[PDB]
Design an enzyme around this catalytic site. Structure first.
Site, PDB file in Angstrom:
ATOM      1  N   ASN A   8       0.850  -1.136   0.000  1.00  0.00           N
ATOM      2  CA  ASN A   8       0.000   0.000   0.000  1.00  0.00           C
ATOM      3  C   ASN A   8       0.912   1.218   0.000  1.00  0.00           C
ATOM      4  O   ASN A   8       1.421   1.617   1.084  1.00  0.00           O
ATOM      5  CB  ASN A   8      -0.958  -0.020   1.199  1.00  0.00           C
ATOM      6  CG  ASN A   8      -1.748   1.262   1.337  1.00  0.00           C
ATOM      7  OD1 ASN A   8      -1.847   2.021   0.388  1.00  0.00           O
ATOM      8  ND2 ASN A   8      -2.294   1.507   2.526  1.00  0.00           N
ATOM      9  N   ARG A  92      -2.499  -2.446  -3.381  1.00  0.00           N
ATOM     10  CA  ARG A  92      -3.651  -1.563  -3.277  1.00  0.00           C
ATOM     11  C   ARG A  92      -3.525  -0.460  -4.330  1.00  0.00           C
ATOM     12  O   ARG A  92      -2.538   0.283  -4.321  1.00  0.00           O
ATOM     13  CB  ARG A  92      -3.733  -0.942  -1.881  1.00  0.00           C
ATOM     14  CG  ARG A  92      -4.875   0.065  -1.789  1.00  0.00           C
ATOM     15  CD  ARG A  92      -5.037   0.760  -0.492  1.00  0.00           C
ATOM     16  NE  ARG A  92      -5.945   1.892  -0.617  1.00  0.00           N
ATOM     17  CZ  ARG A  92      -5.833   3.015   0.055  1.00  0.00           C
ATOM     18  NH1 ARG A  92      -4.652   3.391   0.510  1.00  0.00           N
ATOM     19  NH2 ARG A  92      -6.901   3.764   0.274  1.00  0.00           N
ATOM     20  N   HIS A 181     -13.108   2.065   0.182  1.00  0.00           N
ATOM     21  CA  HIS A 181     -13.131   0.918   1.089  1.00  0.00           C
ATOM     22  C   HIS A 181     -13.666  -0.345   0.401  1.00  0.00           C
ATOM     23  O   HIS A 181     -14.089  -1.275   1.061  1.00  0.00           O
ATOM     24  CB  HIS A 181     -14.001   1.186   2.314  1.00  0.00           C
ATOM     25  CG  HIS A 181     -13.491   2.220   3.240  1.00  0.00           C
ATOM     26  ND1 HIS A 181     -14.347   3.134   3.832  1.00  0.00           N
ATOM     27  CD2 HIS A 181     -12.259   2.486   3.738  1.00  0.00           C
ATOM     28  CE1 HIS A 181     -13.672   3.962   4.615  1.00  0.00           C
ATOM     29  NE2 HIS A 181     -12.395   3.555   4.604  1.00  0.00           N
ATOM     30  N   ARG A 242     -13.649  14.247   9.016  1.00  0.00           N
ATOM     31  CA  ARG A 242     -14.447  14.584   7.854  1.00  0.00           C
ATOM     32  C   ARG A 242     -15.910  14.731   8.273  1.00  0.00           C
ATOM     33  O   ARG A 242     -16.409  14.024   9.172  1.00  0.00           O
ATOM     34  CB  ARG A 242     -14.294  13.520   6.762  1.00  0.00           C
ATOM     35  CG  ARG A 242     -12.888  13.371   6.206  1.00  0.00           C
ATOM     36  CD  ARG A 242     -12.894  12.503   4.962  1.00  0.00           C
ATOM     37  NE  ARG A 242     -11.578  11.960   4.656  1.00  0.00           N
ATOM     38  CZ  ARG A 242     -11.247  10.668   4.722  1.00  0.00           C
ATOM     39  NH1 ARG A 242     -12.188   9.751   4.829  1.00  0.00           N
ATOM     40  NH2 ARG A 242      -9.977  10.305   4.681  1.00  0.00           N
ATOM     41  N   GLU A 386      -8.042  -6.344   4.617  1.00  0.00           N
ATOM     42  CA  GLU A 386      -7.896  -5.930   3.227  1.00  0.00           C
ATOM     43  C   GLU A 386      -6.660  -6.585   2.604  1.00  0.00           C
ATOM     44  O   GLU A 386      -6.698  -6.959   1.444  1.00  0.00           O
ATOM     45  CB  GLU A 386      -7.842  -4.415   3.146  1.00  0.00           C
ATOM     46  CG  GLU A 386      -9.185  -3.756   3.457  1.00  0.00           C
ATOM     47  CD  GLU A 386      -9.246  -2.265   3.145  1.00  0.00           C
ATOM     48  OE1 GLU A 386      -9.384  -1.470   4.098  1.00  0.00           O
ATOM     49  OE2 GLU A 386      -9.185  -1.895   1.953  1.00  0.00           O
TER      50      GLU A 386
END
Lengths: 399, 401
Positions: A8, A92, A181, A242, A386
């Site tokens: 990643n 990723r 996601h 956020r 993941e």
């Protein structure tokens, strides 16, 4: 049995795990930070749980990945004798635009298409590709697979993905809901069905990936239908920093009232909002929890707001699908914040959820059904993985 | 049984809509509207007792001349329904924004005007016009008492965890940023009216009310108090509307600002005027024109309506979850009362949450009070045409008691 390196890569980082497949045992894990800055370093976690920090100058991604590989092979910190033990590399990739619907073996043609999607994730896709280039240099002839955060959501129909904005302007600039996601939503939805003995292709699933970034998805009969994240990761649920969903008119109002331009309002909704912005305490829900114990009313308010918005999405997405069979909680917060799970799932009997408060209470980080046996809707905690999902796609593709 | 006559006004920047109601029955004695006030071609259109529309052209450059003409028409031998202005017992006004100052209707006094002026920043293109109507009446009707009824008032019961946005706390508080809601008088009227029709205790009922007009909003009303509403601080939020976007990704807005070189005012115009059904369809903001375009196989019009219905359906689920269930779902407004195909799409495949819909009863059902759920439905689904003017006249009579 195979060993798969999973990367990643970010603008100033490389996170890695080395997984033994098909079991998914973690042989190694770490991350490079401050890549391309003074005082770049690698932090890893040894099998016995000890954290190790290694300083090394790493001005770009190839030198970073080379150091990672040397650490994997080191006689002190390493877990392999030779690079030939690494059977494949999975990456990723953030944004596959409308070009990718699933994971792919990385070829020159694939790289070209990922480059075309750079405008949709301009601060992510370039770094992701730097990882691929690094591996071609350092492990030549090893085969590589790309797994996209957006790909799972390419089944969404146009009445879901289109915003009710000027048609030509949206089409000109590629404005539509993409979702993120996706690798997590894909992993926990399929995992839930396997655990529960259900046919994925006949099940209506709501998956709630609640972490510092938070999203919820509706997956109907094996295909994603809707997701709370938009073209950008600010939309939907309340998050660490956020905003989630906000009145579009409030944004233009604050621009005039606080003299903010596009960049200023963007920073406000991405960095100064959500749990941090309301609480005035922290983006971290554990620090919120502490502040609540010390009777911080703003922290309590932040959590009330947070839980309420998740609950509304659960209702909305059940309605969107015509019902729900399985509700899955995942992510750092979903796996751990049992009080949120309780608030979300209580007083939901009208739509088939009978919650098991006693089983849920104190339950952190395990795969666990938290609905009562008689609940029509099964509610389950599924810790996400993941990296394993990436390694699993890698092995399927290269088979 | 005695009878009062209440004039009810709704004044906008270029219009005055009026009805004269006989209370307490709520019988309409007169109704019409001035259009293109302050523009060349100003006119009054009224509806005769026979149901036909009559247009009377007349130069009306501002609100006082407009209201004077309205009053002269009410008293006319040909078009009128009263012999003199003394028959008008009171005037009630639609006031758009009461901010956090008003939870219910009030007699308009100098002190009230001052407070309504303080809310002008929250509705800068509506409050001023509303007050011009009040001033016109004080000039034209000696001795008259006037009452204001606020679109925001009904929603002042929402808790802070609902009305607060997840934005910087101090900055929101400084600028009065919070959810206010609109159409409150309509939500208030149809929720109460639904419970009266259905024999339910308003104070113990969970109600979702969908006021679908050119502006569209849905509300959750729990145990006699508004809990949530889809409209925000501004009327762009929530449902897809005629020309307004409804909910969109905040990051899309900042993206379009950079990509199209738009400032705050440009983005504001886009989401208020060029979006919604109009923006997607490329046809019209009017759902009847959409309906026609769909019959002629316009795919963008079909898409607009699929998007429109989908977002209402999601709000129905959301607000049932917010309340812990729902007892009654009410459709109202120009679109809600009339667009039976929307109602059907919204309520079908909702048996998981207790809705069993009656498609045959719903089909072609326009503008009547009518249950459209099947008898066995756990959740009652009802069309209740709204009557904001009656609600205003009713509050007027209560206050001036």
């Amino acid at each position: 049995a195979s060993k798969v390196l999973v990367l990643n890569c970010g603008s100033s980082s490389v996170k890695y795990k080395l997984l033994e497949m098909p079991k998914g045992d973690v042989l190694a894990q770490g991350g490079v930070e401050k890549l391309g800055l003074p005082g770049s370093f690698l932090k890893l976690t040894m099998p016995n749980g000890e954290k190790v920090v290694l300083e090394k100058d790493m001005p770009e991604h190839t030198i970073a990945v080379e150091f990672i590989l040397s650490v994997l092979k080191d006689d002190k910190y390493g877990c392999i004798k030779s690079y030939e033990e690494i059977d494949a590399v999975g990456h990723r990739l953030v944004h596959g635009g409308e070009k990718f619907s699933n994971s792919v073996e990385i070829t020159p043609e694939v790289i070209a298409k990922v480059e075309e999607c750079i405008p949709l994730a301009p601060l992510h896709n370039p770094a992701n590709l730097k990882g691929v280039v690094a591996i071609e240099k350092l492990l030549p002839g090893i085969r590589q697979v790309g797994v996209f955060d957006t790909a799972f959501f390419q089944t969404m129909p146009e009445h879901v993905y289109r915003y009710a904005l000027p048609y030509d302007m949206c089409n000109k600039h590629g404005v539509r809901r993409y979702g993120f996601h996706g690798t997590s939503h894909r992993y926990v939805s399929a995992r839930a069905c396997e655990i529960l003995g259900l046919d994925y292709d006949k099940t209506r699933i709501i998956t709630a990936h609640i972490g510092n970034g938070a999203s919820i998805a509706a997956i109907k009969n094996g295909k994603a239908l809707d997701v709370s994240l938009g073209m950008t990761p600010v939309e939907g649920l309340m998050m660490g920093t956020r905003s989630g969903d906000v009145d579009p008119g409030v944004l233009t109002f604050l621009m005039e009232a606080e003299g903010l331009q596009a960049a200023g309002i963007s920073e406000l909704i991405n960095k100064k909002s959500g749990v941090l912005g309301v609480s005035g305490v922290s983006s971290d829900l554990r620090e919120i929890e502490d502040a609540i114990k010390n009777g911080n009313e703003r922290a309590t308010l932040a959590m009330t707001m947070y839980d309420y918005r998740i609950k509304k999405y659960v209702g909305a997405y059940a309605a969107a699908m015509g019902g729900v069979d399985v509700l899955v909680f995942t992510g750092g917060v979903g796996e751990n914040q049992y009080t949120t799970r309780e608030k979300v799932c209580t007083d939901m009997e009208f739509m088939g959820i009978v919650f098991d408060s006693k089983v849920n209470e104190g339950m952190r980080g395990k795969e666990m059904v938290i609905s009562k046996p008689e609940s029509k809707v099964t509610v389950i905690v599924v810790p996400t993985d993941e990296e394993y999902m990436i390694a699993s796609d890698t092995m399927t593709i290269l088979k």
